């Protein structure tokens, strides 16, 4: 049983013609869609190839097509005939020269012959072999395929979820190579798309609580996970939907080719699956093949040995009257549009034959140009050269495809795989009827029709257990699932350092809404703290008042001392209010010594005519020495005022000892003057009134302490001190007017 | 050509009989050691097997032995004859039924036939293939070997370095499967033994300056890595030593099976490679094989087709061609012209291993039957390989030391046991020769005392020295640390990272050194040396003055309305105040005592002010106590806010920190005393303006200078010095100032 027809080159064909019909236990069954249909597709291509005038003109291509019986072990023994021929060793059935093998539908079959043909360097193009193992070129060195591997569906399904802002996916793989290997790619693909997996459920051919269990393992755990990424086989997908039907589940299944566009998956229980998004392989039916295939007739098809057996099984009749098994075939029986439907993967079978033909055609030009036939160099073929140099780099457009200006580009990648073109289907309800409808293609980039896709909720569903969080809600704690954390509003006035964790450098004053704000305390001014105390200015008013008093003003001794004190008192308010300028408080303390010195001079007069000048210098010297002692080591700078997370102000020196130190010098002078005023009853006693006002000012000096604690409020003491200075000066001038 | 003899179940064999002889382009010669010798071993074993009675008695083993010609591609088409046995598809040499194949030789050959025979489920035992790739049971399922893979050498060599504490090593591999696939295993093995590679050369070319610079790379990069782990091929190992000889370097090479006991590697330039350590597979020569092989005769060995070709090539004659000689009849193989091949033990073991599995299967699948029953008419490779062949445990045949580690068994991957022989190049007087100094079966066992080294001493190859006593500041030279001393008396958490908390404070090197209170501020009169004498002198002066007032009264002097007693009482109280605070400085209340001392000094000054306010005695006495209360009220108010405490005395260095008091509080206390001193200063001016009173005026004027001097001394007293030298001196200065005030007060009473 073999289609061995002669030719300059001969191609090997491996098709599952018998659905374990030669297995001797599942015997008596041949495959129609995956068998003769795909087989005759290759023969159809070969007829076109050898009659084509632009692909191998002088080279007539024969075939050596064998049956794999859908069993890897049977294929291995069969495929040896491709090897037995291309080696160095009455006799009949002279061996051929298999240039390449176009065969292997079931990946288990296509793997066990990939191992064999690799050793003897025979290229192999395999339609319909989408297993991801075959992409491992370390083992299957000489394997190419016109169909994409099954892990490209993982990429497309991941892109579909990522497109719709979807996360928290629950995946339900299936036992076997298909479900398990495919979901590994999807699990890997979800990470790179920042898609997190709620549940990693798995199913098997059990038909037990497992199916009902798997349904609730997603309804119960994370009901926020509304999208379910199926990667199950065909029969498994139906039985899971049956399980979901009984419990009346409501999900938006994002399924793989195993579900596909088959209506038999949802035959019954459609509302539970309504809104699902399933993928299917992209394939444009070959128009010419139907004309060729429908014209087949056992009375004109003698190349195919299985065709006579196919005719019997197709129509359940007998070509010979000796059987009469329920019917005898008749001459008007034929293949027509009603009893036939083109297989989904006929496009890939034709491409596989053409890809081999194109590679052989190109190698015919390079190896020996200007040679219509095949040269003696062509008489020996090398697998490594034919595979990597030409076959693994061909770029011809697909034949028999009406839409040439489309994705009809036949080309193998660096792994010999397909290009990965899919059709994003979507189960839809028209109101009383359910039917699939293509809603998007996936060549390399997804392209959907969002406004024509029915969902299960009649609105675009979202699978979220945590909404995204912003510069508001900066932190991120993860109580349950790794992906949907709970964001926490960061302690106010903070520092972002990470999305997960967020600390606080400057929780008191002036950060940014980003990773920048940390104690960003711009300095204030001389009167910056009392910007809006409510009390602006008023320092020049004391100078104006002092100027008016000076304008109003025998007893030249009082004028000499009183005039200096009035001027110094006014300057204290300006220096105190408006780092170097922070030392003006020393002058104000020295000014009070002038009043004390005058009181001491007045006390001496009441109790050395030339000693008055020396006495003033002696008193002035002490004030200067004290200022130099303190202003020398400390001072000349300003100290900040960082409160308990209130704000940051770069004020003057926070050392209150300078005020206390200054008051000490005045206190001694004031204390001495008060003692003299006690005996000043013999105008007399006017100093006592001025001396008494100093005691109140001394008490007012105490309010400065514990008064500067209020920012911009302690400055009233400086204004009060200036006011106190005016009162003492007013007492001296008040007596004179009377 | 093949030895296709019949049998109940027949084995297959692949041997490199022809050194690419069929590939006449490469070399037409045939292998003798790896070829006929190994082949005849298989035939010798089969003759032994079928003549036994406790291993396949009724099952006569046959052979179908083919020549792999030492090329894998030629082996594949040859091995197909084994494959065609199990195919269900007018004359016909009918095929046999190959239970298993005993062959593979070169790993490249064995890999290709492993792929082919894996598909058709035929077990394969390789007597010589040792590539690490064949241990991957995912690709070569039905493959077993009686020799260990090549990565066990990497495991064995790494254990030699670990045993000898060598940690910083350089490696020099070759190009190809042997050099690469092994050295990567060694590099992985180095991690588990905490070993890092100084430099990893990959000199694999035939002969270029790559080896010359490779020796330089050994010299330049890490000269402190004296031992170098070679994993490179036999011919390459020869030229590397020659390169090392030219530069006249000196290392202690740790080689592999590539450079084993082959003296041809060091033929010439023995001294440069002297002291090396070389591994080599452990194989015991088969005594019975020598009698069989030497007794072979081209007139007796008609089974072997290549024997006539072997006879001609071995003896360089011809049996009939005009060769250099006609093959004489009395030529025979003897000990002079024959040395048993190293791997003959494994060839016999491989045949016996397959025969043992088939016998054990016969005892199970066909019990109570001396022949093979109907079940064995068809054999299943999967069951035979996975159950019987992969779990055999028979002791090696023809082994002299029975019961030793010479037991044939396959591990989970169908590999050999892994026995090696650690050799060492010796200096035997004036001659260099190899000698076994160890054996790595599965744990290293070395004759560590009888091994000669290049430097005549057990060498060490390290780029770092152990900095255990000090220098817990290792810098990671890569993988070897650079130890830096930790700063004097600083904290530590890890020898790798000294985190430098408190340098100069805590004197413990055991992961400490930061602030831990290493000093005490207590100083009993400067250790009773300086300043302590002044404390006792204060009491002596008071006793004389106290008695003097009573003696003068018993009044003889001016009555003064008891003013002298009030002034004397204040003077005594002030003098005792300074001594009391110093005597108890550890207590927290000592700071309060120092603060109260200033009030006593003001009290003595206050008494002078009351005395100065003489020009109403009862009113003056009451007024005097008012000043003390005013000073006491200020002290209580200011002291109440800080309360009782004893702050520390942190220092820039030396770790001199004493919890005595607050320096700022002392300055505040000193400033607080200034307020009382200010009143005393004001009193001095009043007294100056104003017989018996003349003496008081001089004392009051003198007291003013002492107060001014004391205040000036205090600001620079103990402020710029530590509590043991300057602060203690300042404390003594304060004590001296308090005593000096008593002297001024004493002068006034006189
Ligand atoms: N292309 C298939 C894919 C096949 C498959 C397709 C859909 C669902 C389940 C499923 O089972 C597996 C498991 C592992 C690898 C491949 C598959 C191939 O055999 O490679 C096969 C349909 C092609 C055909 O036989 O016509
Ligand atoms: N067993 C060997 C080992 C061989 C080898 C041995 C020593 C040095 C280099 C080297 O090159 C490689 C590289 C990869 C794998 C195996 C080897 C085989 O060829 O398999 C071959 C000696 C055995 C024989 O045929 O006598």
From Swiss-Prot, chain A:
This is Metabotropic glutamate receptor 3. Gene3D superfamilies: 3.40.50.2300, GPCR, family 3, nine cysteines domain. SUPFAM superfamilies: Periplasmic binding protein-like I. The gene is Grm3. G-protein coupled receptor for glutamate. Ligand binding causes a conformation change that triggers signaling via guanine nucleotide-binding proteins (G proteins) and modulates the activity of down-stream effectors. Signaling inhibits adenylate cyclase activity. Disulfide bonds join 27-69, 196-483, 317-329, 368-375, 465-484, 469-487, 490-502, 505-518. Keywords: Cell membrane, Disulfide bond, G-protein coupled receptor, Glycoprotein, Membrane, Receptor, Signal, Transducer, Transmembrane, Transmembrane helix. L-glutamate binds at residues 38, 107, 128-130, 178, 257, 345. It comes from the Eukaryota. Is widely distributed in the CNS. Predominant expression is seen in the neuronal cells of the cerebral cortex, dentate gyrus, and glial cells throughout brain regions. One of its GO terms (biological process) is G protein-coupled glutamate receptor signaling pathway. It is found in: Cell membrane. Glycans are attached at residues 165, 248, 370, 395. It comes from Rattus norvegicus. It is a multi-pass membrane protein.
């Amino acid at each position: 049983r073999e289609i061995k027809i002669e030719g300059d080159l001969v191609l090997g064909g491996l098709f599952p013609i018998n659905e374990k019909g030669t297995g001797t236990e599942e015997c008596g069954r041949i495959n129609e869609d995956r068998g003769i249909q795909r087989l005759e597709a290759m023969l159809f291509a070969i007829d076109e190839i050898n009659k084509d005038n632009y692909l191998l003109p002088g080279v007539k291509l024969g075939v050596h097509i064998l049956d794999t019986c859908s069993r890897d072990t049977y294929a291995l023994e069969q495929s040896l005939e491709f090897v037995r021929a291309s080696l160095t060793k009455i006799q009949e059935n002279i061996p051929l020269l298999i240039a390449g093998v176009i065969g292997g539908s079931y990946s288990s079959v296509s793997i066990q012959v990939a191992n064999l043909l690799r050793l003897f360097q025979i290229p192999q193009i395999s339609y319909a072999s989408t297993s991801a193992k075959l992409s491992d070129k370390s083992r299957y060195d000489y394997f190419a395929r016109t169909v994409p591997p099954d892990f490209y569906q993982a990429k497309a399904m991941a892109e579909i979820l990522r497109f719709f802002n979807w996360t928290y996916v629950s995946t339900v793989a299936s036992e076997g190579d298909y479900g398990e290997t495919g979901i590994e790619a999807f699990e890997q693909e979800a990470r790179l798309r920042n898609i997190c997996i709620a549940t990693a459920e798995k199913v098997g051919r059990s038909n037990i609580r497992k199916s009902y269990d798997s349904v609730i393992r997603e309804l119960l755990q994370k009901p926020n996970a509304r999208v379910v990424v199926l990667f199950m086989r065909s029969d498994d997908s139906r039985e899971l939907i049956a399980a979901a039907n009984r419990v009346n589940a409501s999900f938006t299944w994002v399924a793989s080719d195993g579900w596909g566009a088959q209506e038999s998956i949802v035959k019954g229980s459609e509302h539970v699956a309504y809104g699902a998004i399933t993928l299917e392989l992209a394939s444009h039916p070959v128009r010419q093949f139907d004309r060729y295939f429908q014209s087949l007739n056992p009375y004109n098809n003698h190349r195919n040995p299985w065709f006579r057996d196919f005719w019997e099984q197709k129509f359940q009749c007998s070509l010979q009257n000796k059987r009469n098994h329920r019917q005898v075939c008749d001459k008007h029986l034929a293949i027509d549009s009603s009893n036939y439907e083109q297989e989904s993967k006929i496009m890939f079978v034709v491409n596989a034959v053409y890809a081999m033909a194109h590679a052989l055609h190109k190698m015919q030009r390079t190896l020996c140009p200007n040679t219509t036939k095949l040269c003696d160099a062509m008489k020996i073929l090398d697998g490594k050269k034919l595979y990597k140099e030409y076959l693994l780099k061909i770029n011809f457009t697909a034949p028999f495809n009406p839409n040439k200006g489309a994705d009809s580009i036949v080309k193998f990648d660096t792994f010999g795989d397909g290009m990965g073109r899919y059709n994003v289907f979507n189960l839809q309800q028209t109101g009383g009827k359910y039917s699939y409808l293509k809603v998007g293609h996936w060549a390399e980039t997804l392209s959907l029709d969002v406004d024509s896709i029915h969902w299960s909720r009649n609105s675009v569903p979202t699978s979220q257990c945590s909404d995204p969080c912003a510069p508001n809600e900066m932190k991120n704690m993860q109580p349950g699932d790794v992906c949907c954390w709970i964001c926490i509003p960061c302690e106010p006035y903070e520092y972002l350092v990470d999305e997960f964790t967020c600390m606080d450098c400057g929780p008191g004053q002036w950060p940014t809404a980003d990773l920048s704000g940390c104690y960003n305390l711009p300095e204030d001014y001389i009167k910056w703290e009392d910007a809006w105390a409510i009390c602006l200015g008023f320092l020049c008013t004391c100078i104006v008042i002092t100027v008016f008093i000076k304008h109003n003003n025998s007893g030249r001794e009082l004028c000499y001392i009183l005039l200096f004190g009035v001027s110094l008192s006014y300057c204290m308010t300006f220096f105190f209010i408006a780092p170097v300028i922070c030392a003006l408080r020393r002058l104000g303390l020295g000014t009070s010594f002038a009043i004390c010195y005058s009181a001491l001079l007045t006390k001496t007069n009441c109790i050395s005519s030339q000693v008055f000048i020396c006495l003033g210098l002696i008193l002035v010297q002490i004030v200067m020495v004290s200022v130099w002692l303190i202003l020398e080591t400390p001072g000349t700078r300003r100290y900040t005022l960082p409160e308990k997370r209130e704000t940051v102000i770069l004020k003057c020196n926070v050392k209150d000892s300078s005020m206390l130190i200054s008051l000490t010098y005045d206190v001694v002078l004031v204390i001495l003057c008060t003692v003299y005023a006690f005996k000043t009853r013999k105008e007399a006693k006017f100093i006592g009134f001025t001396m008494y006002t100093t005691c109140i000012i001394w008490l007012a000096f105490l309010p400065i302490f514990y008064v500067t604690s209020s920012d911009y409020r302690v400055q009233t003491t400086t204004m009060c001190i200036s006011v106190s200075l005016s009162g003492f000066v007013v007492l001296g001038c008040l007596f004179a007017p009377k």
